[PDB]
Amino acid sequence: SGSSEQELAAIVRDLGCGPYFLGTHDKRFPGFLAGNKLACAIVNTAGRETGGVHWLAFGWNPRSRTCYMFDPFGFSDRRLKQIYSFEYEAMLRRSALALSPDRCLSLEQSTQTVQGPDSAACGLFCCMFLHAFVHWPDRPMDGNPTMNLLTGVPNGMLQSPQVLPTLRRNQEKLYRFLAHHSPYFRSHRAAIEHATAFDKMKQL
């Protein structure tokens, strides 16, 4: 169910993220502490011991002092804390203290889902976002060749019928994008598309 950390590490590398990528972690990701460089990561909502639950993408732009948090589902921090028991306040504090002279940062996050409610492609959408983030770090969420390929829908509409055709088309365009840019995705395509299926949570 979903993408493994090796799967994501290989795809992220294939996407041209490697030099700016800090790895794949669990909820205990410390933050952007090393230096004031373009940096990103893939962080799980849960601790490694639980086995993993959901994937999130975190980016740092030093020329705007912005931390981008990408939840493919566009849940608010309040909803992330409720649904997934995930909080990243300490992460934001450690980061702004380590990299911001004024001790302030801008937290930019999605309010729209790109993912169907039963889909297990969260890790893969995180890869796509990090591709958009490393190529357009000043505006990674939308208005760039990579995120222009997807159609975000208000998060509040996640469980509604009118949006499944859009959320499925997103998932098909996700695969097509990854097959175009990642040899690792191409090689493991059948196992990746099946384990991250649009309907995977119903097919447990």
């Binding site: 702004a96 302030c104 937290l107 309010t111 729209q112």
Partner: peptide
């Protein structure tokens, strides 16, 4: 793409 919300956080 997705619509976003930008918030300033100071520590």
């Amino acid at each position: 793409g997705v619509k976003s919300l930008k918030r300033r956080r100071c520590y």
